[PDB]
Amino acid sequence: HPVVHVALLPSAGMGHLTPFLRLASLLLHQHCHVTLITPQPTVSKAEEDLLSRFLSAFPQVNQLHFHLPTDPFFLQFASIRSSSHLLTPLLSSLTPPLSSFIYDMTLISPLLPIAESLGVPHYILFTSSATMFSFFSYFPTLAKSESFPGKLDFVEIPGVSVSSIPRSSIPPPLLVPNSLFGKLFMEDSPKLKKLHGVLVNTFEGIEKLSLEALNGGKVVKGLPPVYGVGPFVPCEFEKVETISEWLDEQPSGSVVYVSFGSRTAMGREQLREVGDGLVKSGWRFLWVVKDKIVDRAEEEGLDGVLGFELVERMVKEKKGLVVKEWVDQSEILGHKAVGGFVSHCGWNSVVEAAWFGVKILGWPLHGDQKINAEVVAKGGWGVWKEGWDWEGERLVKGEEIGEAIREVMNDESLVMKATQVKKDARKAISVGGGCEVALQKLMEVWK
Numbered sequence: 001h002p003v004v005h006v007a008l009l010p011s012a013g014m015g016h017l018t019p020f021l022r023l024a025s026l027l028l029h030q031h032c033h034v035t036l037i038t039p040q041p042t043v044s045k046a047e048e049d050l051l052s053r054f055l056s057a058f059p060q061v062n063q064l065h066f067h068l069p070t071d072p073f074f075l076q077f078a079s080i081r082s083s084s085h086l087l088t089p090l091l092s093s094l095t096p097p098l099s100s101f102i103y104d105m106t107l108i109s110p111l112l113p114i115a116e117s118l119g120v121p122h123y124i125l126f127t128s129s130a131t132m133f134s135f136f137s138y139f140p141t142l143a144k145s146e147s148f149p150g151k152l153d154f155v156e157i158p159g160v161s162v163s164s165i166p167r168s169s170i171p172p173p174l175l176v177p178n179s180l181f182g183k184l185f186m187e188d189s190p191k192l193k194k195l196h197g198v199l200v201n202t203f204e205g206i207e208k209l210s211l212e213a214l215n216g217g218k219v220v221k222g223l224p225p226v227y228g229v230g231p232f233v234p235c236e237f238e239k240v241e242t243i244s245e246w247l248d249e250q251p252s253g254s255v256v257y258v259s260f261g262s263r264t265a266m267g268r269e270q271l272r273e274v275g276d277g278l279v280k281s282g283w284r285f286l287w288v289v290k291d292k293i294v295d296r297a298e299e300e301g302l303d304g305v306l307g308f309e310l311v312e313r314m315v316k317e318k319k320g321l322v323v324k325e326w327v328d329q330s331e332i333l334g335h336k337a338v339g340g341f342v343s344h345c346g347w348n349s350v351v352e353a354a355w356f357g358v359k360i361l362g363w364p365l366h367g368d369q370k371i372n373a374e375v376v377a378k379g380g381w382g383v384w385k386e387g388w389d390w391e392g393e394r395l396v397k398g399e400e401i402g403e404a405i406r407e408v409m410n411d412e413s414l415v416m417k418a419t420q421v422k423k424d425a426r427k428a429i430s431v432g433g434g435c436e437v438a439l440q441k442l443m444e445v446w447k
């Protein structure tokens with residue numbers, strides 16, 4: 001019996017490894033021989049731990065390694081992109097015969113020629129939102145102007161979920177000429193037409209308009225088909241028990257879970273304004289803290305990071321729990337005791353909240369996080385304060401944070417729309433949904 005051999009190449013960061021491994025699980029449950037390529041060394045320890053648990057759960061995955069010669073994650077983005085065009089010997093000698101190839105969206109330019117020489121249908125996995133991909137697709141046109149970048153107050157793509165993207169929501173690095181992110185956007189987006197398709201962890205329940213505009217040509221004429229293979233359901237290998245038991249003693253829909261991702265640390269005095277606003281809200285909270293970008297370099301303890309003033313106020317309540325570790329976020333969002341999510345609006349944690357029907361308080365910080373926020377705000381199951389701006393540009397006080405939390409928690413209008421998203425997320429994976437329809441199409445082509 002023949003085989004459908006799928007090779008996967010993720011990039012640095014849990015925001016990229018987690019959706020790739022969930023995609024790998026979906027393919028493995030579709031009887032695909034999966035080859036997973038991991039560049040070494042991995043940036044974070046969570047990437048190290050997740051891979052060791054994934055390959056312990058799926059030992060039939062053909063794992064291939066290779067070594068490599070600003071931000072630590074944005075640097076490994078280059079050491080994979082720039083250094084190792086010597087990825088061809090790993091891909092061109094795969095047995096059983098390769099059937100397809102899916103690589104990270106941040107590696108389009110160097111991997112596109114490698115993929116074209118493999119003679120198999122090749123795709124990208126866009127870990128962010130389809131609305132963000134439409135921005136990535138439409139970027140070469142608005143940068144082509146002489147008005148770029150100084151004169152561009154609004155980005156307007158026809159038919160996407162966010163019709164009017166103000167300058168405030170554009171990633172700051174893109175507005176600066178000769179930026180590393182500007183170099184990548186101009187180098188990759190024109191090469192999108194060479195691809196056989198784009199896979200996005202999203203579904204019609206949240207980005208109905210963006211998927212219809214991309215596949216309708218109304219964004220860029222000739223774009224490859226965009227397959228909404230979301231929502232990526234969290235698998236069992238992702239879990240690594242105080243937090244497990246503390247949530248069992250809290251009322252349902254009363255804990256506000258706060259996490260700003262895996263690769264973002266707040267400023268020390270802005271971080272202390274969060275805990276100030278948490279206790280000022282009178283609500284139970286589960287706050288995940290990061291003092292550094294990479295979890296390996298966590299130097300100082302929580303008593304020194306939060307300060308003696310806020311530490312005195314935290315333990316006086318026992319109403320909330322603060323940790324500075326890697327937690328099973330999908331295990332927290334799935335708990336019935338959680339009703340609110342203060343999130344940096346990274347697309348993985350956004351779709352996860354959509355999967356568990358948890359309303360979101362959006363606090364975007366860098367990059368695409370502001371676009372993903374208004375994508376949620378359009379859906380009616382989340383709020384985000386536009387004047388709070390990016391991380392570092394402003395000091396959001398604890399009084400505003402406390403208000404913004406109390407605003408979201410007692411707003412049942414969001415919950416009524418948060419469960420509707422949860423209902424559509426289940427229909428997306430059932431028979432006839434957008435994901436199962438798209439997966440069976442790609443499966444039949446790879447034979």
Ligand SMILES: O=c1ccn([C@@H]2O[C@H](COP(=O)(O)OP(=O)(O)O)[C@@H](O)[C@H]2O)c(=O)[nH]1
Binds near residue numbers: 263264326
């Ligand atoms: O303590 C943590 C922090 C993050 N995550 C997971 O890591 C991903 C975060 O990626 P996202 O794109 O949301 O933000 P990024 O980390 O890329 O900024 C999501 O799948 C979260 O569920 C987790 O499981 N535990």
Ligand SMILES: O=C(CCc1ccc(O)cc1)c1c(O)cc(O)cc1O
Binds near residue numbers: 188
């Ligand atoms: O805007 C994006 C999209 C990421 C991206 C990078 C390269 C590429 O070719 C396509 C998409 C972005 C940033 O700018 C900065 C971030 O911290 C995160 C983030 O998601």
